[PDB]
Design a protein around this ligand. Sequence first.
Ligand SMILES: *[C@@H]1O[C@H](CO)[C@@H](O[C@@H]2O[C@H](CO)[C@@H](O)[C@H](O)[C@H]2NC(C)=O)[C@H](O)[C@H]1NC(C)=O
Ligand SMILES: *[C@@H]1O[C@H](CO)[C@@H](O[C@@H]2O[C@H](CO)[C@@H](O)[C@H](O)[C@H]2NC(C)=O)[C@H](O)[C@H]1NC(C)=O
Ligand SMILES: *[C@@H]1O[C@H](CO)[C@@H](O[C@@H]2O[C@H](CO)[C@@H](O)[C@H](O)[C@H]2NC(C)=O)[C@H](O)[C@H]1NC(C)=O
Ligand SMILES: *[C@H]1O[C@H](CO)[C@@H](O)[C@H](O)[C@H]1NC(C)=O
Ligand SMILES: *[C@H]1O[C@H](CO)[C@@H](O)[C@H](O)[C@H]1NC(C)=O
Ligand SMILES: *[C@H]1O[C@H](CO)[C@@H](O)[C@H](O)[C@H]1NC(C)=O
Lengths: 329, 329, 329, 167, 167, 167
Amino acid sequence: GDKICLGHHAVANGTKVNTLTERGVEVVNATETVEITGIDKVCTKGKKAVDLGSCGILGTIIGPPQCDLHLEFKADLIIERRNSSDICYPGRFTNEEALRQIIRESGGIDKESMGFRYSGIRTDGATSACKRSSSSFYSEMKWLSSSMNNQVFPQLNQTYRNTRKEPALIVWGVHHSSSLDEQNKLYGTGNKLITVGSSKYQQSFSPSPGARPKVNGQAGRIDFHWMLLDPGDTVTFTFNGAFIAPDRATFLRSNAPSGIEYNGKSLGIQSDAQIDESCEGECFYSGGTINSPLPFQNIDSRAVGKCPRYVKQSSLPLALGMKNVPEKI
Amino acid sequence: GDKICLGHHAVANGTKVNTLTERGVEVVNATETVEITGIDKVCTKGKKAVDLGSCGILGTIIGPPQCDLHLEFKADLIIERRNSSDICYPGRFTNEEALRQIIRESGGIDKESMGFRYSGIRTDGATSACKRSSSSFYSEMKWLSSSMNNQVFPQLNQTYRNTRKEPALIVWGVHHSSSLDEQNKLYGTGNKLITVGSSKYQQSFSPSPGARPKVNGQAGRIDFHWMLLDPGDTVTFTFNGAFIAPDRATFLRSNAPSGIEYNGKSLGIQSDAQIDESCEGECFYSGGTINSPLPFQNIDSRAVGKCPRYVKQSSLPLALGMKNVPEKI
Amino acid sequence: GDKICLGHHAVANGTKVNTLTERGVEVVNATETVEITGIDKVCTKGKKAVDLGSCGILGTIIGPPQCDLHLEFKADLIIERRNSSDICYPGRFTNEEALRQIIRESGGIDKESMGFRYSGIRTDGATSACKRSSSSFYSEMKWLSSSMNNQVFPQLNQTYRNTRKEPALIVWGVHHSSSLDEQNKLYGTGNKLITVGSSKYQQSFSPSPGARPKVNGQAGRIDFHWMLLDPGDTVTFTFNGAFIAPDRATFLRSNAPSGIEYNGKSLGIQSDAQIDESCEGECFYSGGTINSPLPFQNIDSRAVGKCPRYVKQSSLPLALGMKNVPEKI
Amino acid sequence: AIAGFIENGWEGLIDGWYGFRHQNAQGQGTAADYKSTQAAIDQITGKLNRLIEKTNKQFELIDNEFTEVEQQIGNVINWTRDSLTEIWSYNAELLVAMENQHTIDLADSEMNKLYERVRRQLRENAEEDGTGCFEIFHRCDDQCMESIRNNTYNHTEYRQEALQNRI
Amino acid sequence: AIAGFIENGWEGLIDGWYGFRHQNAQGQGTAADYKSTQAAIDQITGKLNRLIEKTNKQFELIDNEFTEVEQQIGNVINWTRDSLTEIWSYNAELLVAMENQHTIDLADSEMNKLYERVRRQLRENAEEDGTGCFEIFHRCDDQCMESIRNNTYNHTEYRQEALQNRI
Amino acid sequence: AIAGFIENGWEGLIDGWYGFRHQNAQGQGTAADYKSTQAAIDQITGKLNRLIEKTNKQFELIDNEFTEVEQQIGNVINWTRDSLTEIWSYNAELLVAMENQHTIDLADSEMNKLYERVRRQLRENAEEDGTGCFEIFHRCDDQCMESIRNNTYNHTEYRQEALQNRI
Ligand SMILES: *[C@@H]1O[C@H](CO)[C@@H](O[C@@H]2O[C@H](CO)[C@@H](O)[C@H](O)[C@H]2NC(C)=O)[C@H](O)[C@H]1NC(C)=O
Ligand SMILES: *[C@@H]1O[C@H](CO)[C@@H](O[C@@H]2O[C@H](CO)[C@@H](O)[C@H](O)[C@H]2NC(C)=O)[C@H](O)[C@H]1NC(C)=O
Ligand SMILES: *[C@@H]1O[C@H](CO)[C@@H](O[C@@H]2O[C@H](CO)[C@@H](O)[C@H](O)[C@H]2NC(C)=O)[C@H](O)[C@H]1NC(C)=O
Ligand SMILES: *[C@H]1O[C@H](CO)[C@@H](O)[C@H](O)[C@H]1NC(C)=O
Ligand SMILES: *[C@H]1O[C@H](CO)[C@@H](O)[C@H](O)[C@H]1NC(C)=O
Ligand SMILES: *[C@H]1O[C@H](CO)[C@@H](O)[C@H](O)[C@H]1NC(C)=O
């Protein structure tokens, strides 16, 4: 008797996958869904990248020596490094994380003088902690010291109006000396006060003398404080010592008018890996770059950029063919 | 040959929809799922609404002139406007956002006198920035000035125990004068300190004199500070100048005993649109009201109220009919 | 005629369940998916648990009387109670919640002396608010008072380097006296300042005298302030009065070297229920323990531990059998 | 020449979702089947079932469109929000596509069930043509056709004639 | 008179999910089909598979039921929490409902497969009655019935008698 | 002896997803069916459709791997992130499993449809053997077989021979 049969393929060994009903169902073919391997490079082909090296990203603003080449950077991708420092003379920024976030997306920074001039005082204080040949300071500010040696310190005002149509980033420092001897040696004797006024911002600060553990061989500290000054608005510094003054204001290339020094929002990453101008990626993490066709990744939940979605699972196999049912006898 | 056929409808032209497998499959009928158009009104029919106008919602508490009609409002829906100010004499609240959130849900506010009386001093300081006739002040507080002209200022105490079974909202101000001439002109000469004690709260404050950019022609500022005083608890203000004193405490109608002046939690919104007593809605945004049968919306991810779920997509067509297969020949 | 029929079971009355298409479809059998009942005990079998009783979890650090037995606890599960106090002499921690979180996961705490000795002064201040027999203080600190009665107070330094390879938890207090008479009665007369320096940390503090509502019959307060001092780093206290000094530092058993006093991350819960050594559980809430086979729970969205997922619905019936179709005639 | 659903659909059936088209000596006709039409139409109210997940829950402002919140918490909020948006966008598109598949599949299913039911009424009196029609191997006047449509047809009444014509 | 699954369910089959009911000269009986019952029962372990998503992951307290956290971060937390609750509530209801559809569909599937299998055993010896039974066109005593149930029946053994009785 | 898909799969069919295996006087052959193969293969591009949900949306750092953020907001961030991770992990596993079910089900579906189509071509000329084969009750030479595979076969040309052999 003549006969015709309908049938479908099968293979000796298939791949297990999961369905809704069942687990470990064998199919003719499957493919992985979850990327598990990264590129141990920062893949920078076709973007403008800056490796900030040992320069902490906040350093770009105030300008310790290690940041000299980075005071006006233009970047599509900013690579912070693990060892970085924002400082030379020891100290902290208030709201430090907030600012890091601001710089990371800035697209780079552009500097412009604030036209502060002085006359009564020394405006060139220098430390061994900021070595740039002999001794210098924060490139972008000025350490306002007592003009003689033990001279009480003038009750000075300084004012700067934001000319541009972008926000201006202004930063100033408060000098916490190592001893009350050195404080009134470098400034005046009576209690010292710094008032900083915006339209919006309004708060004040005064100096806490006292010995702290030496950091870069300095017992002193600087509190760094910062504000974004709105277009049109003005800021007034009123101070009688212990004041580290801004010299240049910062602007973010991301808010500039279509012209040179624009960039557009950048992506800040933090990374351990060597740069490679020779590969691409839009997704980064500490170990480097995730460039993958798959839709998920299990490498690093903190990957940043344009990324496969992160999942806790290492493998999620996707069936590319029918249930595998071997040939009977 | 006699014959019977089974068949289903079709139309010449159907709508494309997506399934799981496939994209752009044609069905007899579909309907949209994502609302994309709003009502450009605030739809307030069947609710108690107040348009705070130029009165900032924090103003309701301390009472600058622009807030006169709002010192004891009852509201189901509170409309903040874009231009609003909480102030007349320039300044900020500490923790300003937290408080805005408190008032927004309050259901309105109710005032109660705290019975502070004075005698040594002037308790009627007034400014040109708070014009209500000639010159006045924050309706709900009192500017404690030096009684003569350059008189040092008494070391005063004031105490207020929360009588009610609801929390009381107490707010006080610190006066940062334009110059140290004006400070000790309006108060005493020796350093001035303000200590504010609850059972729970305990912190202090002192005044930072110094010239700031003029705001409403005042170089001065007031730091506004606030506390929620628990039922039973008491609060002590101890101060020697620079003190803007509370006169009435605030209570939230949302915590009142079933009686008049209750309301229940309100919804605070921020909006540009005109009010319309003539339409309803439970979902609001800056452009107005989202009143829609659909389950999703692509209008504004910050819509508040009871809202369609927000989605990035502008259209998600839902099949209301079978797959469309035109008639062959 | 002979006949054979194929058929499936049915029951008189089935259970309604939901599908995708339809609602209230009857199936032969179903089972609940959402746990709605808890165990009204804390189920502590197989773990090391400490019931902190009336001892606030921050008390374990500084050692008010009620916390005597808890100064060096070792715990897998820490039960805060509703009534707890961290204090005897009234006061607050700055950043109090952050620290609570640190202790909760600590696995218990281990103390080690910081080797501060004194000589000029009295270091044995005691209060009636910290009754342990007669009058005492915070077991773990020392109230540095004026040595005589109205003696001005020495300009003292103290330094402590973190020996261990774990972080050290250091806490100190600022004493806000009830009156300026008592302040300069218990200390010196001129303004008093406390400077606290880490490598990282650097800020200062001064005392606000003034009367506050009595708490445990004390108008005074202590601001408690804390730091985590990194391995290798050192901290310097410089102070001239109003200083409540650390005596022992805290370490978290979670960072100790495999040896005794290790534990490993603990789970902190807050609970009303009696302890029961007699039942198990890995999920807790204020009402007790959730120990259940089902995958969801509607009991408490803040349950902590390893927990069914929380859902707003009280029941989600799952079909364990086919659609129910009764027998016709 | 007439054809069933395997071939295609019927632009002329404007009266229902499913229907019968016949041919006999008296001519050619199409009529909607009411019951299966309603059956299909009744499982179509997705819109407020897609909506019945629309919340009991009221949400408030967490940030400020007029006076910007401080940068750090503003970043956390914004991040959280866009995170929830990715998720609801994904949920919405998945729910719609699942509903769309169910609607299409269930339409075929109903058509197939009607077809199977008619085949079983006709027993040995008809053969499937391969296009969704039955060739009926006996005269079936308008009333006989009606009886197939309303599930009244008694195969034994035509069996003998049909068997003869089949063999 | 007996009827199959297309008509309805069998309240009296308490012994299995699926079964055969027969009629012959020796009388009338019902017997569960073990194999297809187990097959169905084996795909029913949803409860701990719905549970196998129950987390490895431990969560800690983020706020405070005893000493309320500061207002702003308390609002962000609360908002985030209610947001995750909307999401899990929606996931839970969707997972259950999908499992429910699968369970119902697959039960029909098994019943239908048993039915198709018997139809194919019987070949030309029997005709579907349209209620889920086969009219058998030859004597089928208890042992012959048994042979249908245990997949032993050899159609060629009765073909000639059955064809005669059909025609 | 040859057997169809109800029994098992064909290890030897390396040319397609589905196919015909025949036996006649001139021997035994297997040929892939191209059309239904492509049909199945065409609904397989899941990888970039699973990927078409891969975001337009760019995310930035919210915390710090080098200089740890303040404890309380770091706890909130961390908690939020792990919460979103639970959710995406759950979505990913559900999406994959649903795609997997659909792929398996739809493969059976296509095989079933090819089979149904052939059954309807053969009309009364063949009987289903119950393994996925048709016993053809007339001589079917290679060219007749080809005509079954390419949907050309004209049943009326063999009906009279086939009916005689069946009865
Ligand atoms: C199973 O599928 C995998 C992956 O989809 C197949 O490997 C691919 O095959 C193409 C066809 O030649 C190759 O060019 C690609 O380079 C492979 N891609 C990947 C990602 O591996 C494999 O061919 C399939 N196996 C069978 C029997 O079909
Ligand atoms: C497709 O269904 C839509 C939407 O449900 C139908 O539009 C409705 O038609 C009724 C009766 O005419 C109106 O009163 C409704 O208000 C309509 N709703 C909307 C949202 O427009 C539409 O007619 C349908 N098309 C077909 C071919 O059935
Ligand atoms: C419906 O299924 C439920 C739940 O699985 C059955 O009840 C369980 O069955 C075992 C078997 O003996 C009992 O010992 C368990 O204690 C039951 N568990 C629960 C959750 O209560 C129930 O018997 C079934 N009913 C029918 C008609 O099948
Ligand atoms: C989030 O905050 C940014 C500034 O960080 C602001 O421009 C924007 O209005 C916010 N985004 C939304 C849609 O809330
Ligand atoms: C959130 O905060 C309120 C007060 O802010 C508190 O009473 C409430 O219990 C919290 N809600 C949840 C769901 O935790
Ligand atoms: C979150 O912060 C902890 C400490 O709070 C830190 O050790 C860890 O790097 C973070 N975890 C993740 C995965 O973000």
